[PDB]
Write an enzyme that holds these catalytic residues in place. Sequence first.
Site, PDB file in Angstrom:
ATOM      1  N   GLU A  40       0.798  -1.228   0.000  1.00 29.84           N
ATOM      2  CA  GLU A  40       0.000   0.000   0.000  1.00 29.84           C
ATOM      3  C   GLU A  40       0.833   1.281   0.000  1.00 29.84           C
ATOM      4  OE1 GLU A  40      -3.092   0.016  -0.674  1.00 29.84           O
ATOM      5  OE2 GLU A  40      -3.846  -1.968  -0.139  1.00 29.84           O
ATOM      6  N   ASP A  64      -6.166   6.309  -4.972  1.00 31.81           N
ATOM      7  CA  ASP A  64      -5.712   4.920  -5.045  1.00 31.81           C
ATOM      8  C   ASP A  64      -5.736   4.406  -6.490  1.00 31.81           C
ATOM      9  OD1 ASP A  64      -8.361   4.110  -5.656  1.00 31.81           O
ATOM     10  OD2 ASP A  64      -8.730   3.206  -3.704  1.00 31.81           O
TER      11      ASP A  64
END
EC number: 3.2.1.17
Length: 164
Positions: free
Chosen positions: A11, A20
């Site tokens: 991440e 994202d």
Amino acid sequence: MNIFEMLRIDEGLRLKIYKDTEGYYTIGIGHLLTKSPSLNAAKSELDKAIGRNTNGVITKDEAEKLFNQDVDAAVRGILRNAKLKPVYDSLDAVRRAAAINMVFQMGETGVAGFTNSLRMLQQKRWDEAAVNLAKSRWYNQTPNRAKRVITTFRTGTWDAYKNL
Ligand SMILES: [Cl-]
């Protein structure tokens, strides 16, 4: 290696609001804020999550706090899900991390629809499970990350993360 270090690799860490892989406002270690295209809405979610007026920037400590909560939430979600819990319970600790990773990324509902993969995982048909897992939007959209998670399911080792 463990679930925290694993997800940290997958991440990253960013202390300002970013989008994202799906274009959704996110912060810290993959903390999804909202699917709304409104930055103001994302900032509102952030302030609510942190408990202060942030204006889109948080500290490392704050990012890690949300991260811990999110990992906890993923595990708790698996355990409360009738489809996911038996499969998770059937796994060793390394493969359990791979399970948490998936739920962290796509949510309980999304994972619970990997019915055929889940069956193969509970059956411990690792190579077959691996092949099936890759036949997914998930793999096609995030192939490098999916490949790491799938290797973890296939081998029950940290080999896909040991080097990075
Ligand atoms: Cl911002």
